[PDB]
Write a protein that holds these residues in place. Structure first.
Motif, PDB file in Angstrom:
ATOM      1  N   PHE A 121       0.806  -1.209   0.000  1.00 11.65           N
ATOM      2  CA  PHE A 121       0.000   0.000   0.000  1.00 11.65           C
ATOM      3  C   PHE A 121       0.850   1.276   0.000  1.00 11.65           C
ATOM      4  N   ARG A 122       0.209   2.415  -0.229  1.00 13.22           N
ATOM      5  CA  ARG A 122       0.911   3.705  -0.353  1.00 13.22           C
ATOM      6  C   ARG A 122       1.661   4.066   0.924  1.00 13.22           C
ATOM      7  N   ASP A 123       1.105   3.649   2.075  1.00 10.94           N
ATOM      8  CA  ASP A 123       1.740   3.880   3.391  1.00 10.94           C
ATOM      9  C   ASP A 123       2.901   2.879   3.718  1.00 10.94           C
ATOM     10  N   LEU A 147       4.121  -6.265  -4.839  1.00 10.36           N
ATOM     11  CA  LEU A 147       3.375  -5.627  -5.889  1.00 10.36           C
ATOM     12  C   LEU A 147       2.794  -4.292  -5.381  1.00 10.36           C
ATOM     13  N   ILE A 148       3.086  -3.214  -6.092  1.00 13.93           N
ATOM     14  CA  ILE A 148       2.647  -1.871  -5.672  1.00 13.93           C
ATOM     15  C   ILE A 148       1.197  -1.653  -6.130  1.00 13.93           C
ATOM     16  N   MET A 149       0.296  -1.578  -5.173  1.00 10.58           N
ATOM     17  CA  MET A 149      -1.114  -1.427  -5.484  1.00 10.58           C
ATOM     18  C   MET A 149      -1.406  -0.055  -6.102  1.00 10.58           C
ATOM     19  N   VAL A 198     -10.456  -0.855   0.662  1.00 14.03           N
ATOM     20  CA  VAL A 198     -11.234  -1.811  -0.141  1.00 14.03           C
ATOM     21  C   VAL A 198     -10.551  -3.185  -0.227  1.00 14.03           C
ATOM     22  N   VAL A 199      -9.226  -3.195  -0.257  1.00  9.07           N
ATOM     23  CA  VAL A 199      -8.499  -4.468  -0.469  1.00  9.07           C
ATOM     24  C   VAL A 199      -8.653  -5.377   0.705  1.00  9.07           C
TER      25      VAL A 199
END
Lengths: 121, 121
Positions: A34-36, A68-70, A78-79
């Motif tokens: 995730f971005r964080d 894997l970069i979401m 949501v994931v």
């Protein structure tokens, strides 16, 4: 001649084992980032039973240090509930997320989740 | 507050998908090789739900060209029915193989299959 004997409710047996593996991150073969920078480790085959979207992400998104970069539109809000649904058949969600989860299931073409979110009577 | 909705009989849904993957060799991550050089491709996590024996084989047996070389006592006559059982909950077997399958489940400590082979009334 060929005989056969069976254990009833094999699906229930198997799911219990699979859920345990997920909780302990045993046999996981796909790491979602995730971005964080937080991560969720999963089983590719479990995700693939419900959707081909993670297959397309693996074809089109960056991999950094085995993760894997979401995409920006597909973060933990949501994931995490969707992945938990893929392992269990239960979707846990706050109502405020209903429309976002429905739009996400439509982007994924995750038919089984679409049908659930659209269920009536 | 947190809501929840569910798809009934998730185990049945999931097993159907998993069986299809097995039949098409999709997402397989372990190749078993027999003495006759034939191969059976499987999912490590499916095998692991029932036993740790394949884990020990991966720790102790030779790997040639991405395939695990099965021991002499663990060839297709027992492996194929046992693996099909792990995917389905059904063991198909000729009676003449009962004792060999029971001795093999005892060597594997595959409790769920032991219980099935020893079931009564």
């Amino acid at each position: 001649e060929v005989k056969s004997v069976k254990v009833d409710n094999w699906g229930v047996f198997f799911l219990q084992k699979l859920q345990n593996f997920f909780n302990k991150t045993d046999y996981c073969d796909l790491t979602l980032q995730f971005r964080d920078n937080s991560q969720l480790k999963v089983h590719r085959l479990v995700l693939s039973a419900c959707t081909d979207y993670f297959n397309v992400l693996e074809q089109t998104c960056e991999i950094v240090d085995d993760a894997l970069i979401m995409p920006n539109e597909f973060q933990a809000d949501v994931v995490v509930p969707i992945v938990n649904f893929m392992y269990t058949g239960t979707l846990e969600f706050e109502l405020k997320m209903y429309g976002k989860l429905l739009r996400t299931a439509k982007e994924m073409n995750m038919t089984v989740l679409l049908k659930l979110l659209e269920a009536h009577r």
